[PDB]
Each structure stands twice: as C-alpha cells, then as structure tokens.
Amino acid sequence: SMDRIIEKLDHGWWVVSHEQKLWLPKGELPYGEAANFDLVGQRALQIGEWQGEPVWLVQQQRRHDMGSVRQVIDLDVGLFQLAGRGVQLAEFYRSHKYCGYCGHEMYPSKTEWAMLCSHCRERYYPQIAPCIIVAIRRDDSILLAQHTRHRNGVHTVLAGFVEVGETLEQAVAREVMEESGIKVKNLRYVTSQPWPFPQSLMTAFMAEYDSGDIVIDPKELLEANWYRYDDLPLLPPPGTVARRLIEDTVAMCRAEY
Amino acid sequence: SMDRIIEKLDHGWWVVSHEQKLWLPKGELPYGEAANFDLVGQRALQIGEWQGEPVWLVQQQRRHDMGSVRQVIDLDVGLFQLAGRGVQLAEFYRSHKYCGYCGHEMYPSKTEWAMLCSHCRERYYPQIAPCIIVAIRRDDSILLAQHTRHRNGVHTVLAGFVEVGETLEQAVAREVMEESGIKVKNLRYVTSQPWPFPQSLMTAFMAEYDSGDIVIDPKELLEANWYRYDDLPLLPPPGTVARRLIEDTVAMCRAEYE
Numbered sequence: 119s120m121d122r123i124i125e126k127l128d129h130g131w132w133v134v135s136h137e138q139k140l141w142l143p144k145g146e147l148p149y150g151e152a153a154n155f156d157l158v159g160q161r162a163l164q165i166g167e168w169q170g171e172p173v174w175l176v177q178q179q180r181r182h183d184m185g186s187v188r189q190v191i192d193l194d195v196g197l198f199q200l201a202g203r204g205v206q207l208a209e210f211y212r213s214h215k216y217c218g219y220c221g222h223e224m225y226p227s228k229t230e231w232a233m234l235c236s237h238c239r240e241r242y243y244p245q246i247a248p249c250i251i252v253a254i255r256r257d258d259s260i261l262l263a264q265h266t267r268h269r270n271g272v273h274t275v276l277a278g279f280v281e282v283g284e285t286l287e288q289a290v291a292r293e294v295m296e297e298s299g300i301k302v303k304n305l306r307y308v309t310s311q312p313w314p315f316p317q318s319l320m321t322a323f324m325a326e327y328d329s330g331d332i333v334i335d336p337k338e339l340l341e342a343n344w345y346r347y348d349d350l351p352l353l354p355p356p357g358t359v360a361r362r363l364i365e366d367t368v369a370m371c372r373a374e375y
Numbered sequence: 376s377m378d379r380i381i382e383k384l385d386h387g388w389w390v391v392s393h394e395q396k397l398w399l400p401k402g403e404l405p406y407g408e409a410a411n412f413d414l415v416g417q418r419a420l421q422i423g424e425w426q427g428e429p430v431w432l433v434q435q436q437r438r439h440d441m442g443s444v445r446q447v448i449d450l451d452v453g454l455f456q457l458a459g460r461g462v463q464l465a466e467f468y469r470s471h472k473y474c475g476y477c478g479h480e481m482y483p484s485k486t487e488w489a490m491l492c493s494h495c496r497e498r499y500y501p502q503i504a505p506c507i508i509v510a511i512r513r514d515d516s517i518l519l520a521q522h523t524r525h526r527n528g529v530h531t532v533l534a535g536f537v538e539v540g541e542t543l544e545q546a547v548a549r550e551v552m553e554e555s556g557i558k559v560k561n562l563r564y565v566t567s568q569p570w571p572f573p574q575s576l577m578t579a580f581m582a583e584y585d586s587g588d589i590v591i592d593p594k595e596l597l598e599a600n601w602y603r604y605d606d607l608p609l610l611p612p613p614g615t616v617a618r619r620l621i622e623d624t625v626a627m628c629r630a631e632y633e
C-alpha cells in the first residue's frame with residue numbers, strides 16, 4: 119500500500135482514471151517515466167506491479183482518449199487485471215466521498231484501500247460483486263442464448279449476480295431456473311475472472327442438463343437453444359471466461375463424440 | 376422483492392434486525408404469528424421462504440435479546456442462511472441512508488434489493504466480500520494453524536479476503552504465501568458458503584503442497600504445522616466451512632492411503 123506524490127524517478131504502467139474510464143493515448147495503456155505524461159507532482163496510488171514495473175493509479179481525467187479498459191484486454195492477463203484494479207479503485211473512492219451511514223465526508227485510509235468516516239465509526243472497502251457463469255451441456259449440445267439487455271447477435275452462456283445469503287451453487291440453480299426453466303446437475307467449478315464492468319468477480323461453472331423444457335424470461339433472454347458442438351452460432355470473444363467455458367464444452371464433446 | 380405492512384395473521388420466521396444483530400428471545404429465532412411479536416402494522420420485507428412459511432425482515436431493535444446470528448447456526452443451513460440474509464440486508468439499507476456520491480438521501484428500489492439516488496443516477500447493491508479458505512494437503516498431512524486473532528486452542532485452515540482485481544486462485548496462493556510462506560499447486564474448488572460476519576462469501580479450496588517451509592507472521596498466526604490426517608488436533612465445530620474442508624481433506628487422504 120503506497121499513496122504518494124509522483125517524482126521524476128517514478129515509472130511504469132499508468133492507469134489514469136475517472137468515472138469508469140481510463141486514459142488510453144494511442145489506444146495504449148500509458149508506459150514509461152512520469153515526466154513523460156506530465157504526472158510529476160501528481161498524487162497517485164501504487165496498485166501493484168507487473169514484471170518489475172509498478173502499476174499506478176492517478177485519479178484525474180484527461181481531455182482526450184478516455185475510454186473503456188476493455189480496449190486493452192489483449193494485454194497480459196495479469197496486467198489487464200491490474201488496470202481493472204485501477205478503474206475499480208477510482209470508482210470506489212468516487213463512490214464513497216460521503217458516508218452512507220451519517221452523510222458526513224469521508225477520508226482515505228493509509229493502512230489499506232478503504233474509506234473511513236470522520237464523524238462516525240464506519241468503514242467501506244471496495245465492492246466486488248460475485249457472479250456465476252455456467253455453460254450447460256446436453257449430450258452433444260450446449261445451451262446458448264441471446265441477451266435482451268444488450269443486443270449483439272452473439273449467443274453465449276448463462277450468467278448472473280450471486281444474491282445475499284446464497285451459495286454459488288444456489289446462484290447457478292436460481293439463475294438458470296429463472297432464465298431458462300431447466301434444471302442442471304453435476305456442477306463443476308472451472309475458474310474465476312475479475313470483470314471490471316463495473317465490479318464483478320466471475321465464477322465459471324460447467325453443468326449438465328437434468329430436466330425441464332426451455333422457457334425463457336424475455337426480460338433477460340431473446341431466445342435460447344441447444345446447439346450441437348459442431349454447428350455453433352456467434353460466440354463471445356476469446357479472452358472472456360464465457361468463450362472458454364463454451365470451448366471446454368465443445369472440445370469435450372468432440373473428444374467424446 | 377416484496378415489501379408490506381404486516382397484518383394480524385402474518386406468520387413464519389421473523390428476522391428483527393438492527394446493527395449486525397437480530398432479536399433472539401430466549402436465544403432462539405422468533406417463529407409464529409405477527410400479533411405474538413407485536414409486529415402488526417410494521418413494514419416488513421419477505422427475504423425468503425422456508426418450508427412454505429415466509430421468512431420476514433423487520434428493521435427495528437428490541438430492548439432485550441439482540442444477539443449475533445451465529446446463535447442460530449446450529450439450526451439448519453437454510454434458516455441460518457436466511458437469518459444471515461436478513462441481518463446483512465438490514466446493514467446494507469442502514470449503510471446507504473445517504474449517497475456516497477452526492478450526499479443526498481437515497482431511496483430503496485421497489486423491484487430489487489438496492490439503494491437508489493434521485494439526485495445523480497448512481498446506486499448501490501448489497502456488498503458481498505469474497506473470501507478464500509483453503510485446506511493445504513501434503514501427502515498424508517494437512518496444514519493446520521492457530522490464530523492470534525482469536526486464541527481458543529483450535530487448529531483450523533487458512534482464509535483471507537479476495538482483493539480487487541485478483542482471481543480466487545491468486546487469492547489462495549497469496550494468503551497462503553503471506554501467512555505460512557509456502558507455495559501451493561493443484562487447487563480444487565470444493566464449495567461455497569455465505570458467512571454473515573459481517574458479510575462474506577467463503578470459497579472453499581483444497582491445495583497440494585508444492586514447496587517452501589513454514590514461516591509465519593505472528594500478526595496472523597500463533598503457530599502452524601503439518602498434521603497427519605488420522606491424528607488431528609481440535610477442529611472447528613461441525614457446521615462451519617472450515618470443518619467441512621478438513622473432513623473432506625481427511626476423507627481424501629483416506630481414499631488415497633488406505
């Protein structure tokens with residue numbers, strides 16, 4: 119945990135963020151010495167380190183080239199995760215200018231990433247929202263769906279935020295039943311992924327069909343169907359955990375059929 | 376979401392919460408009819424259903440018997456999870472009376488559990504803190520530690536909050552490395568469990584010893600060692616994630632060594 123003024127001798131990867139945006143001059147995550155980005159004398163937070171290079175967060179906005187961290191998703195996974203960290207932390211501090219409990223103004227910790235209240239005894243820590251995402255397998259088929267919320271002509275797997283007081287398993291069961299009306303069996307954890315859009319922690323699952331006919335919630339899904347492994351529609355981009363689930367499923371179907 | 380004024384014959388379980396506590400008359404969860412608990416004409420929120428009977432949340436404090444939700448942990452998993460949800464929800468609403476962005480007074484969503492601002496478009500959802508917990512295996516042995524944080528003579532597994540921007544995997548490797556100074560491999564997710572103290576979600580993991588020696592920070596642990604599976608010390612009570620992890624680990628050892 120390092121929170122200080124930037125000197126000429128400071129260098130590395132610079133996450134310059136404001137309101138869920140980051141500064142991408144030339145579509146690049148800023149790299150190099152501080153003076154080369156006019157950051158000398160600017161307050162900054164070291165949010166990590168990638169291959170010897172410190173990753174910094176600067177809470178300011180520029181005039182041009184502000185955009186989504188999704189633009190730099192083709193970088194090393196660890197570096198992308200660190201940039202996402204920058205964006206999330208800036209949005210956290212911005213989200214806690216005032217105390218939710220008593221309405222007084224808050225101030226940063228110096229121990230950790232946290233916002234402490236001057237008046238009352240309350241704290242906040244950056245919010246990570248756990249999410250489930252599951253690829254459901256049926257024999258030689260996988261269930262894929264088009265999403266109502268944002269339309270893209272891409273078919274993908276099922277996802278949803280975990281609720282308070284429920285386990286990941288219950289969250290998969292609940293989300294799947296709510297969206298498609300079917301029941302699954304043989305839940306299988308695969309991996310997890312930080313998804314700063316805005317603040318989700320993905321937990322990825324494989325599952326098999328159990329029973330029920332596909333009955334969709336139109337507020338969430340435009341349509342959903344069983345697609346055989348060999349003849350697939352349009353998939354989410356590689357680099358996302360969704361495509362990865364889809365393709366573990368597919369590779370498995372091929373290998374087994 | 377459902378949110379109503381309580382009438383004479385409303386019935387079921389009553390999570391009466393305020394400040395990380397719930398009303399536990401004579402040390403049990405209030406069950407029965409509204410009139411029996413003076414809850415008539417009060418705003419309640421249906422937070423779930425258990426065996427047909429609704430589980431309600433009332434945001435008030437009684438003068439006596441306000442305790443920890445862990446006092447009902449040994450009632451079943453579902454009911455305890457719902458009490459946890461009630462307490463956590465109460466804390467959430469209390470934590471978002473004012474908006475952290477602008478400072479104005481927020482309003483509750485009618486469709487979901489959320490706090491909304493009419494001044495700026497921002498909003499908040501209940502905060503769940505992802506937390507890894509890991510049973511580290513080394514052949515027939517499993518790593519057990521004693522915490523300084525609470526000193527009761529119970530040897531349990533390692534755990535730690537997941538950081539912003541890190542995977543569960545990275546979190547396990549990290550916490551293990553900081554607390555014990557050993558490296559792990561072959562992580563296997565076991566299960567998850569909500570843990571309302573105040574508001575975390577445990578992800579239980581098993582790991583195999585890769586390399587390193589036990590070097591601890593005393594700020595976290597009083598001691599830490601390798602215990603063979605059939606010769607265990609005192610463990611956490613049955614009903615916690617920790618004991619499940621340890622028992623499953625021992626079962627695994629049982630499966631590979633006898």
Ligand SMILES: NC(=O)c1ccc[n+]([C@@H]2O[C@H](COP(=O)([O-])OP(=O)(O)OC[C@H]3O[C@@H](n4cnc5c(N)ncnc54)[C@H](O)[C@@H]3O)[C@@H](O)[C@H]2O)c1
Pocket residue numbers: 247249251267277278279280281311313315316318320354358359360361500501
């Ligand atoms: N491959 C991937 O990494 C991948 C794939 C798919 C979805 N995601 C992410 O998983 C999340 C889930 O997406 P979605 O399908 O539900 O659509 P979504 O992003 O629109 O969110 C769904 C709804 O749930 C609610 N919600 C938001 N935050 C919440 C919270 N913290 N707790 C409870 N409810 C909340 C909101 O009403 C939101 O409308 C999104 O961030 C999406 O960005 C990642």
Ligand SMILES: NC(=O)c1ccc[n+]([C@@H]2O[C@H](COP(=O)([O-])OP(=O)(O)OC[C@H]3O[C@@H](n4cnc5c(N)ncnc54)[C@H](O)[C@@H]3O)[C@@H](O)[C@H]2O)c1
Pocket residue numbers: 243244504506508524534535536537570572573575577611615616617618
């Ligand atoms: N059997 C079980 O289920 C079991 C077992 C062991 C520990 N736990 C729980 O796991 C949780 C965390 O593990 P712990 O023992 O290290 O907790 P801890 O509170 O003892 O230590 C974590 C530290 O990080 C801080 N912190 C609090 N919330 C945070 C957040 N959302 N993000 C980042 N930092 C935060 C805390 O102030 C604390 O100082 C605890 O709630 C604990 O009760 C459960």
Ligand SMILES: [Zn+2]
Pocket residue numbers: 217218219220221222235236237238239240
């Ligand atoms: Zn306050």
Ligand SMILES: [Zn+2]
Pocket residue numbers: 474475476477478479492493494495496497
């Ligand atoms: Zn506001």
